[PDB]
């Protein structure tokens, strides 16, 4: 019963976690666009990578 | 003074020179202020295409 309670919930938990990883990747890619354009410096681009990791 | 007297001048021909030297200074100031905000507008136009 504990194994089935884990199986029924870890699907939604992993779906939420990999959607969080995808949103952090999109945020980092927008910060990389702002760095390549010229608006932001390297300190903020490096700050986004730590949240991604 | 840049014209021969008693002659026929055209529309827009330069007649004198009134020693700019100050209008040159504030023209340089306005140009320097333009040259940063122009680059900022050109950068924000490239950034707004995908909502950065």
């Amino acid at each position: 019963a504990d194994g089935l309670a884990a199986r029924g919930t870890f699907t939604e938990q992993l779906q939420a976690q990999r959607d969080l990883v995808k949103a952090s990747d999109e945020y980092y890619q927008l910060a990389d666009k702002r760095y390549r354009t010229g608006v932001d410096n390297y300190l903020t681009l490096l700050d986004a990578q730590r949240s991604l990791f | 003074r840049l014209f021969k007297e008693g002659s026929d001048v055209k529309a827009g021909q330069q007649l004198y020179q009134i020693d700019p030297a100050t209008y040159e200074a504030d023209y340089q100031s306005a140009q320097a202020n333009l040259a940063s905000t122009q680059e900022q507008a050109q950068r924000y136009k490239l950034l707004v295409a995908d909502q950065a």
Side-chain angles (χ1 to χ4, degrees), chain B residues 28-48:
Chain B
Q28 277 167 11
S29 177
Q31 184 69 41
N33 189 27
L34 164 74
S36 90
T37 181
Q38 181 175 39
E39 300 184 11
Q40 194 191 27
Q42 287 162 2
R43 282 168 177 143
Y44 276 43
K45 188 181 162 64
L46 303 169
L47 286 189
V48 78

Side-chain angles (χ1 to χ4, degrees), chain B:
Chain B
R1 189 196 86 227
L2 296 193
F3 60 94
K4 178 175 193 318
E5 311 196 336
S7 84
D8 287 330
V9 297
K10 271 186 288 295
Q13 180 183 309
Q14 186 191 347
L15 300 180
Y16 299 82
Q17 175 84 63
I18 314 170
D19 188 23
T22 298
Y23 308 108
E24 191 78 44
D26 49 56
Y27 170 71
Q28 277 167 11
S29 177
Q31 184 69 41
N33 189 27
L34 164 74
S36 90
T37 181
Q38 181 175 39
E39 300 184 11
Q40 194 191 27
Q42 287 162 2
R43 282 168 177 143
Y44 276 43
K45 188 181 162 64
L46 303 169
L47 286 189
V48 78
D50 45 1
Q51 302 260 39

Side-chain angles (χ1 to χ4, degrees), chain A:
Chain A
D2 280 356
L4 288 182
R7 174 199 274 196
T9 46
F10 264 109
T11 300
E12 284 109 325
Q13 183 176 1
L14 267 196
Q15 187 57 50
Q17 197 64 39
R18 67 176 80 258
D19 279 26
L20 162 52
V21 161
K22 182 171 54 67
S24 284
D25 210 324
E26 289 172 12
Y27 181 79
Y28 160 71
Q29 279 202 4
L30 296 160
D32 191 87
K33 265 169 216 182
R34 285 168 61 99
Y35 168 69
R36 288 285 192 273
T37 286
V39 166
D40 286 330
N41 42 351
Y42 210 46
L43 273 300
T44 310
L45 173 70
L46 260 53
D47 217 38
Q49 276 207 4
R50 294 182 273 253
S51 64
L52 174 62
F53 293 150

